[PDB]
Design a protein around this ligand. Structure first.
Ligand SMILES: CC(=O)N[C@H]1CN[C@H](CO)[C@@H](O)[C@@H]1O
Ligand SMILES: [Ca+2]
Length: 883
């Protein structure tokens, strides 16, 4: 006591009606607030700062409810003060939570589970507290800097206008890159020089200085970094991949170049990044990770990178001009794990709202990135505008004409402004596009000529509009704000259609990304229409893992397409995540520096030696087996690596874990296993190489995925055929195979869910518990259910981003299979019939757990011996000895 029984109010961000926020606080147990959407929390204001001692919660029924409670004394930071996570039913007595006399002027109650419904409810909440006679501070409004007012603008224009200073900046930066990549002690071993292009082509040179140093030339930063990487690869037996394993062991003394090389590239652009990459991989990156990525980019020849960092701030400024408060902008914008699908006009709100601190920090990080890109000569691809608006835009802007875009995977797509209207009508496309490009100037300045936007990505609705005319006006509006603008358009599954593309009246000022050139090339339509286009290796879908690459097509199809085209202005990568198969990415970027088809077999041989720091006859044969199996050329259509059955929702006739995925292994399994035998045989010799271990974990977990499939098939034959003792035995081995897999996965820092979760929880500083918990939800949801019930199930997104990850395998994948088995056993043993499992409910239970109250996943890899684990795999859990 005493009960705060006066002056209290409540807000909510959604409700079924008329089950509205205030009904949670009316002193009436028969009336209740109930959620309608994914905002499953209410905010209660206490009429002043109290020292809470108790909070009492009643629900509308007797279901099992789980919730987390947060308080704020400053009006900004909401910290967790209490929670219910036990499995007790609610009853007429309510739940009483003892508080330790915490100062609170506001409280948040986030009901994360209702065992009975997708909706949550609070019938009543009483708060018990001592009045401090204080009030909450006024919360400060979001205030960001204008680019021109910042130290960033001065630097940007100084570099821009001053050759000598720009050259000095660039050369000193490449020096810094050397120190970051191989070590500070090697910096002074290189001399870097700016030269001209080679017949209008980007170009580098590697030669001796005369006094034992390496002299590297290049027309810009990326050429210089590419020359630095050429030298390491071809003279030092060194290989750099900050994400997927390196060998950075330098020779004791710097090896001579001998004959000077001059290497040019026929491609104006080398492109990197899907919109999805920003979500599946980069959601929770800090500057350390970004800087490290741009170093790897520059070193692989990349000079065109997609960039959406801080675009939340650009849009906030845009929407503020058209009737939207900052709270409403925050409700529009998704959480930090979802920006790919938010900027692709597919989904809103989900994972949000972002903290207020978000905007300033992200604008700053993007400003930082453009400074570094400027030194290298990497063009960012900023945002274009195509008419995207919230669904309530007309409400707030009545003369506005809009087009409803329908659903995407159970999500409500944002609206789209009519790209043109009739005479006599207000043209809001022109109004919002004018503000949008203007505001993107104010945040970042004139940093780029390349702008990316993609109306009607994976659905939508063109309404009454002419398809060509839509693309004409989008481009003409873009060129109006930058006369040198190039519209970067994705080419995904035959869209945009030809007649949309024919509406582009300035062909040289668009550039189409052929997204999936290595499985499903679709550039001939673009080439015929004289559109500048880029050949891209997509490769990776959703971050889903497995041994999968197309190195032969990369080594042949790229130069072939150059020879057979006039408008191929580049090559690139469009992966949905960068987490898998480094060979694939190194070869693609290596193909920029050649006009001829190469030998993918001898390129691998060379590759593996510099990646491991050494090679032998046996390692080579193991890799040839891989080239002959998992990496063997194929001519069918498929999206990513063949999927592991371990990662699939349990059932009969499973042919995938994700909706558009595939689990059919197209190579001989016993033949692939030979690679693992050879790796285990050579483990002791090669365990000094971290990239060897990484590659060994990759093939071994592939082996167990492969054999898991066979054991799965045998065990549900056993169920179907009535036995019995058989099913139990085979299902026993299946679960044990997963426990061995889990140990294989504990070995790599990159396979740890704890790194993923912690990165999310700590990506900002000064964060409250509310924000950390919410960013953890984003991290957990993405790799599992993706959205909520209607996105996971009806929307088809269940386990789209399934990861063969430690912790996730123990507590999610293994748990599902164990239950299903447990399960069919109770049936087969004279019980049951086995009930229908509501899988989403089980998956979403894990999604909503918090690291600081439930279980904290490790950020430290284990010392398990992959050679030993491999022996156990071959002996006990293989196809070869399967029986
Ligand atoms: C849910 C998801 O990630 N969907 C992606 C499917 N593949 C397309 C091509 O990369 C993407 O545009 C979608 O966002
Ligand atoms: Ca009530």
């Amino acid at each position: 006591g005493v009960e705060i029984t006066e002056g209290v109010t409540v807000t909510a961000k959604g409700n079924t009606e008329g089950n509205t926020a205030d009904l949670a606080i009316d002193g009436d147990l028969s009336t209740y607030w109930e959620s309608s959407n994914d905002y499953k929390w209410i905010e209660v204001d206490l009429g002043g700062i109290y020292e809470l001692s108790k909070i009492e919660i009643f629900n509308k029924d007797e279901a099992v409810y789980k919730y987390n409670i947060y308080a704020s004394e400053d009006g900004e930071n909401f910290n967790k003060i209490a929670y219910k996570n036990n499995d007790n039913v609610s009853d007429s007595n309510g739940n009483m939570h003892t508080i330790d006399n915490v100062r609170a002027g506001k409280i948040r109650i986030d009901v994360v589970q209702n065992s009975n419904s997708d909706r949550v409810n609070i019938a009543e909440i009483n708060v018990f507290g001592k009045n401090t006679g204080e009030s909450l501070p006024e919360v400060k409004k979001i205030a960001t800097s204008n680019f021109s007012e910042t130290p960033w603008a001065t630097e940007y224009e100084k570099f821009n206008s001053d050759s000598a200073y720009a050259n000095e900046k660039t050369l000193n930066e490449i020096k810094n890159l050397v120190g970051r990549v191989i070590g500070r002690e090697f910096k002074d071993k290189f001399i870097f020089e700016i030269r001209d292009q080679l017949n209008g082509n980007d170009v580098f040179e590697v030669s001796d200085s005369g006094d034992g140093k390496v002299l590297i030339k290049g027309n810009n930063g990326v050429s210089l970094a590419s020359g630095f990487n050429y030298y390491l690869k071809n003279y030092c037996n060194v290989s750099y991949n900050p994400i997927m394993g390196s060998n950075l062991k330098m020779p004791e003394t710097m090896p001579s170049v001998g004959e000077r090389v001059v290497i040019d590239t026929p491609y104006e652009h080398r492109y990197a990044l899907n919109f999805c990459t920003y979500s599946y991989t980069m959601s929770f990156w800090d500057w350390d990770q970004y800087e490290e990525f741009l170093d790897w980019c520059a070193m692989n020849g990349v000079n065109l990178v997609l960039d959406i960092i801080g675009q939340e701030e650009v849009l906030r400024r845009t929407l503020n001009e058209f009737g939207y408060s900052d709270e409403e902008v925050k409700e529009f914008i998704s959480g930090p794990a979802y920006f790919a699908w938010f900027y692709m006009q597919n989904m809103t709100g989900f994972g949000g709202p972002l903290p207020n601190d978000w905007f300033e920090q992200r604008a700053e990080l993007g400003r930082k990135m453009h400074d570094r890109m400027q030194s290298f000569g990497i063009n960012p691809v900023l945002q274009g505008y195509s008419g995207m608006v919230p669904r309530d835009f007309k409400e707030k802007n009545q003369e506005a004409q809009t087009i409803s875009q329908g659903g995407w995977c159970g999500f409500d797509r944002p609206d789209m402004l009519k790209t043109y209207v009739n005479e006599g009508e207000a043209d809001y496309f022109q109004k919002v596009a004018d503000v949008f490009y203007e505001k993107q100037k104010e945040v970042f300045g004139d940093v780029t000529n390349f702008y990316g936007v993609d109306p009607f990505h994976e659905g939508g609705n063109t309404g009454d509009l002419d398809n060509g005319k839509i693309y004409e006006i989008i481009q003409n509006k873009m060129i109006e704000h930058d006369n040198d603008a190039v519209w970067v358009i994705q080419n995904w599954q035959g869209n945009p259609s030809n007649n949309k593309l024919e509406g582009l009246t300035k062909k040289d000022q668009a550039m189409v990304l052929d997204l999936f050139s290595e499985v499903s090339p679709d550039w001939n339509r673009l080439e015929e229409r004289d559109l500048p286009w880029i050949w891209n290796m997509l490769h990776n879908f959703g971050g889903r893992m497995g041994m999968d690459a197309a190195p032969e097509k990369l080594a042949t199809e790229i130069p072939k397409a150059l020879a057979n085209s006039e408008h191929m202005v580049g090559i690139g990568i469009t992966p949905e995540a960068i987490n898998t198969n480094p060979l694939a990415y190194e070869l693609l970027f290596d193909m920029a520096w050649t006009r001829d088809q190469i030998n993918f077999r001898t390129w691998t041989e060379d590759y593996i030696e510099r990646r491991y720091g050494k090679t032998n006859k046996e390692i080579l044969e193991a890799w040839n087996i891989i080239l002959d199996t998992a990496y063997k050329k194929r001519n069918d259509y498929y999206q990513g690596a063949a999927e592991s059955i371990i990662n699939a929702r349990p059932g009969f006739g499973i042919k995938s874990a994700s909706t558009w995925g595939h689990s059919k292994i197209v190579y001989d399994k016993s033949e692939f296993e030979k690679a693992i035998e050879i790796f285990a045989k050579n483990y002791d010799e090669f365990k000094d190489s971290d990239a060897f271990l990484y590659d060994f974990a990759d093939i071994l977990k592939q082996l167990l995925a492969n054999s898991a499939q066979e054991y799965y098939e045998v065990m549900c034959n056993a169920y179907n055929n009535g036995n019995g003792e058989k099913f139990k035995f085979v299902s026993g081995k299946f679960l044990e195979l997963i426990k061995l897999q889990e140990r294989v996965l504990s070995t790599r820092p990159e396979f740890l869910i704890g790194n993923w979760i912690e990165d999310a929880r700590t990506m900002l500083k000064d964060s409250d518990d509310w924000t950390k918990d919410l960013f953890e939800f984003n991290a957990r949801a993405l790799v599992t259910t993706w959205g909520s019930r209607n996105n996971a199930d009806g929307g088809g997104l269940k386990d789209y981003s399934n990861r063969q990850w430690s912790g996730l395998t123990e507590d999610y994948y293994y748990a599902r299979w164990e239950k299903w088995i447990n399960g069919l056993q109770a049936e087969l043993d004279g019980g049951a019939k086995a009930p229908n499992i509501d899988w989403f409910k089980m998956e979403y239970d894990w999604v909503n757990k918090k690291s600081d109250t439930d279980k904290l996943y490790p950020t430290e890899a284990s010392n398990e011996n992959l050679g030993e684990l491999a022996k156990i795999a071959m002996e006990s859990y293989s196809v070869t000895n399967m029986d």
